[PDB]
Amino acid sequence: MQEHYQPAAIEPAAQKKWDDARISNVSEDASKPKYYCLSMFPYPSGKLHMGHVRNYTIGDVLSRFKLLNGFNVMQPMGWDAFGMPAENAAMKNNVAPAAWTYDNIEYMKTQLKSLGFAVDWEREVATCKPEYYRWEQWLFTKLFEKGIVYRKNGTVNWDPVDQTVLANEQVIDGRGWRSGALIEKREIPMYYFKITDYAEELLNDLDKLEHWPEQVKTMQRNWIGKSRGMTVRFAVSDDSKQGLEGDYAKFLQVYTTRPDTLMGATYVAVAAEHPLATAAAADKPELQAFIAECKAGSVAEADMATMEKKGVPTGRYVVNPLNGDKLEVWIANYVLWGYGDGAVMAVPAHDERDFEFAAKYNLPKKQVIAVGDNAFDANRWQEWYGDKENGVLVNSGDLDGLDFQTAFDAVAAKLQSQGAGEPKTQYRLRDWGISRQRYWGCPIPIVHCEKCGNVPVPADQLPVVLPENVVPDGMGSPLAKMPEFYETSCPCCGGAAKRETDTMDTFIESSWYFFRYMSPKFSDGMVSAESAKYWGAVDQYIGGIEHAILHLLYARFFTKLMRDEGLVNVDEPFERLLTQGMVVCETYYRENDKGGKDWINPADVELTGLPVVISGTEKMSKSKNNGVDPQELINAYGADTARLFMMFAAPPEQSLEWSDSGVEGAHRFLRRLWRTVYEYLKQGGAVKAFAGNQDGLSKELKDLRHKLHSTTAKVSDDYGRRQQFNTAIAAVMELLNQYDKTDTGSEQGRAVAQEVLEAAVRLLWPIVPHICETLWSELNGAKLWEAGWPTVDEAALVKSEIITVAADIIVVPGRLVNIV
Numbered sequence: 001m002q003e004h005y006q007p008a009a010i011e012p013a014a015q016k017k018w019d020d021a022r023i024s025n026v027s028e029d030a031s032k033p034k035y036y037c038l039s040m041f042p043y044p045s046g047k048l049h050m051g052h053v054r055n056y057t058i059g060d061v062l063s064r065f066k067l068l069n070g071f072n073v074m075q076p077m078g079w080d081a082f083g084m085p086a087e088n089a090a091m092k093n094n095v096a097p098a099a100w101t102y103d104n105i106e107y108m109k110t111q112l113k114s115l116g117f118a119v120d121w122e123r124e125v126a127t128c129k130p131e132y133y134r135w136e137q138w139l140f141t142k143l144f145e146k147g148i149v150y151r152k153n154g155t156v157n158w159d160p161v162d163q164t165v166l167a168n169e170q171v172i173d174g175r176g177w178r179s180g181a182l183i184e185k186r187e188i189p190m191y192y193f194k195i196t197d198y199a200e201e202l203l204n205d206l207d208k209l210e211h212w213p214e215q216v217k218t219m220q221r222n223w224i225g226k227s228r229g230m231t232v233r234f235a236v237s238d239d240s241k242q243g244l245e246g247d248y249a250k251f252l253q254v255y256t257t258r259p260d261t262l263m264g265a266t267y268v269a270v271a272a273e274h275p276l277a278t279a280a281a282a283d284k285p286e287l288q289a290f291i292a293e294c295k296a297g298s299v300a301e302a303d304m305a306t307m308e309k310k311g312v313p314t315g316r317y318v319v320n321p322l323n324g325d326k327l328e329v330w331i332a333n334y335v336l337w338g339y340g341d342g343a344v345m346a347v348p349a350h351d352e353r354d355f356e357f358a359a360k361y362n363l364p365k366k367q368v369i370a371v372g373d374n375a376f377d378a379n380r381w382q383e384w385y386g387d388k389e390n391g392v393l394v395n396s397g398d399l400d401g402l403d404f405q406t407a408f409d410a411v412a413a414k415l416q417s418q419g420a421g422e423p424k425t426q427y428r429l430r431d432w433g434i435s436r437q438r439y440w441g442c443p444i445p446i447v448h449c450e451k452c453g454n455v456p457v458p459a460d461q462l463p464v465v466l467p468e469n470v471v472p473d474g475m476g477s478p479l480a481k482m483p484e485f486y487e488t489s490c491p492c493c494g495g496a497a498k499r500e501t502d503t504m505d506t507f508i509e510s511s512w513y514f515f516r517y518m519s520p521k522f523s524d525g526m527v528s529a530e531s532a533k534y535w536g537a538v539d540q541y542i543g544g545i546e547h548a549i550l551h552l553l554y555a556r557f558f559t560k561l562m563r564d565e566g567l568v569n570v571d572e573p574f575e576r577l578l579t580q581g582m583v584v585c586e587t588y589y590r591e592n593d594k595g596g597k598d599w600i601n602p603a604d605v606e607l608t609g610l611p612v613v614i615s616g617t618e619k620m621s622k623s624k625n626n627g628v629d630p631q632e633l634i635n636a637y638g639a640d641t642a643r644l645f646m647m648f649a650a651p652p653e654q655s656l657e658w659s660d661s662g663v664e665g666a667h668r669f670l671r672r673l674w675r676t677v678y679e680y681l682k683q684g685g686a687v688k689a690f691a692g693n694q695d696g697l698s699k700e701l702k703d704l705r706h707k708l709h710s711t712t713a714k715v716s717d718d719y720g721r722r723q724q725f726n727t728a729i730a731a732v733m734e735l736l737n738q739y740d741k742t743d744t745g746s747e748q749g750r751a752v753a754q755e756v757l758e759a760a761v762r763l764l765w766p767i768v769p770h771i772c773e774t775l776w777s778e779l780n781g782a783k784l785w786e787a788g789w790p791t792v793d794e795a796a797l798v799k800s801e802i803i804t805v806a807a808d809i810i811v812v813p814g815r816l817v818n819i820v
């Protein structure tokens with residue numbers, strides 16, 4: 001054992017020792033309890049980020065903890081490899097996205113290996129390989145036959161300068177993000193998953209997930225957005241039927257979740273595309289213009305409520321079926337065609353959006369709900385205006401006095417008795433559109449034939465291979481310009497036919513990769529039956545909150561689809577979910593000649609030519625050029641320091657501030673750990689660790705054993721139960737502090753010192769395995785992973801007794817107890 005801690009010496013040896021042992025290469029071992037720990041696999045975009053290292057260290061702590069506890073742990077890693085970045089690099093550097101993707105995969109793989117993650121690299125998948133994506137093409141074809149996947153026209157944002165389709169997130173005031181040209185809205189046929197057939201299932205099964213953070217579950221419920229409401233029909237007034245045809249000339253139909261307030265309706269609102277808007281706009285240019293601007297909008301869902309609500313009166317009227325009052329129809333920009341009837345009623349007194357809209361336009365507000373003795377002011381919204389549970393009806397004639405549910409059913413009955421309405425269940429959830437007009441993605445296994453239609457590719461013929469010898473240009477997705485790809489024969493009649501050239505939403509790869517890891521070389525299905533039965537579901541999933549809605553929903557959806565096909569036998573893919581925090585860092589800048597700021601990367605500054613300006617701390621990103629390269633942290637200090645800093649700086653959910661002093665402190669503590677073992681061995685070598693009856697130990701050594709087995713209990717509860725790793729590390733530091741202040745020089749003192757150190761290096765092994773593996777080998781000759789996780793010695797927690805009273809009519813505890 002050298003005197004000085006040199007991580008570049010020991011970290012490669014430990015990694016080779018673990019790999020030669022095949023500790024992380026696992027099989028379907030029925031004689032060991034399985035544990036599947038999974039971190040959200042990365043985009044291979046070149047280099048690991050510091051947040052990558054935080055995520056995968058967290059995964060590795062939990063994985064190593066269960067390993068030391070005797071679990072057969074699978075911790076797989078792979079590459080979410082399709083997507084836009086490789087096409088961007090291919091337009092920048094003039095290389096093939098596949099060449100760029102694979103070179104990044106190899107580099108990032110070395111990075112992960114140098115960090116010592118206990119990963120089964122024999123289960124590695126790369127989603128851009130045909131061996132992977134053939135199976136999602138296969139699932140596509142099966143669902144297409146059942147109609148769960150279907151084709152229908154949708155509207156897209158066509159950028160006419162860049163010559164490709166843009167998401168709403170890439171449209172800024174109607175203009176493409178890069179080009180700057182006005183977007184065109186175009187209707188093209190695309191493919192959809194009928195995820196709405198699974199709405200109630202995906203909502204209800206959320207209640208099974210007792211170990212999910214409740215905010216993730218709440219976000220999923222709000223996204224599915226089930227509600228139980230009422231269809232209500234408002235008869236069109238005789239004076240308003242001009243230009244209307246069909247049922248639109250008879251009535252305006254609306255959906256509402258608050259039919260108990262229908263006596264409170266003071267106007268109604270329709271979508272820009274509603275027939276009443278069309279009929280009203282026919283002789284009114286201002287309505288025509290209002291409709292045009294609504295159609296030309298690109299309000300993304302995540303911004304829908306941040307949009308300013310606007311409308312225009314149409315001059316048409318409808319009749320409330322309950323009280324007969326005539327309501328003017330307004331066209332409103334917040335009423336969305338395709339969500340239900342594309343038309344709503346408005347009750348300004350008991351709906352905040354209606355309150356704000358009515359206040360802007362001085363539309364009337366009519367109270368029909370009362371709560372307690374609260375004051376109703378028609379000018380100031382109050383939160384009790386929208387209370388359902390604790391409200392009573394007023395100004396509603398027959399319905400006065402009723403609560404929410406009873407008035408609901410009474411309104412239902414009144415409407416049904418007139419044939420003017422009926423109860424109705426709705427979902428905000430939209431079907432999942434998966435067509436992308438992109439090259440670097442999984443081809444859609446459909447062939448178009450003029451006689452046979454859209455036909456799925458036979459399974460015998462899958463994969464439809466994406467040709468990798470392609471360099472995107474900047475004038476359409478290449479596939480549409482490659483007859484060598486799309487020209488083919490019809491698999492049903494053999495005639496002249498064309499392959500679909502759109503590719504799949506890349507969320508699709510990430511919706512089932514956790515099952516592929518169970519048998520990533522299985523050539524006869526998505527996942528082998530024997531492996532799916534053994535591994536079951538993911539026990540622990542770790543990933544960022546940015547994937548808590550879409551990706552998790554899609555993964556849960558795919559799991560039920562695969563279950564329904566008989567490929568798996570679980571309802572839910574992920575049992576426990578941990579959301580790790582972002583990583584932040586200072587920013588630096590220097591003003592430029594044009595009155596702006598040029599952002600300086602922290603690696604290119606000298607702290608304390610001419611200096612730059614220190615600025616505000618935010619998430620590491622290419623936005624303000626403030627990303628700290630994890631590889632430089634590894635080269636300077638070793639993987640163990642990097643791992644420790646990230647786990648000590650902050651609890652997992654909290655954002656982690658980059659800290660140069662924090663890194664140095666992490667390294668100093670690893671130095672201290674090394675010196676403590678070295679000095680313990682330099683005095684008189686290793687001994688058998690203390691065990692058994694501790695009667696006759698001195699108080700000082702009993703107190704060290706108390707602190708020791710207390711620390712083991714604390715750290716076990718922190719790894720397993722609370723998943724708070726920073727407090728586990730400080731608890732081991734406190735143990736070493738007490739050891740430092742204990743004379744352990746006697747025969748019994750050495751035996752207790754051995755016990756302390758053998759436990760400490762095992763307790764820290766999931767955090768810093770390279771140095772602990774090395775120190776454990778100097779202290780004990782058994783395999784660390786065979787010694788296993790430290791066990792708590794309950795006797796070491798028994799305090800000495802002191803009638804006689806244990807350490808847990810006057811009466812003073814521990815001096816007397818005057819019976820008076």
Ligand SMILES: CC(C)C[C@H](N)C(=O)NS(=O)(=O)OC[C@H]1O[C@@H](n2ccc(N)nc2=O)[C@H](O)[C@@H]1O
Binds near residue numbers: 042
């Ligand atoms: C399951 C699929 C949909 C995952 C998808 N490939 C993805 O997000 N890939 S990824 O490469 O973007 O990130 C992988 C993981 O690492 C975290 N990360 C990353 C970078 C960073 N600077 N800080 C972080 O915390 C990020 O939140 C995520 O949990």
Ligand SMILES: [Mg+2]
Binds near residue numbers: 208210
């Ligand atoms: Mg349960």
Ligand SMILES: [Zn+2]
Binds near residue numbers: 450451453490494
């Ligand atoms: Zn045909």
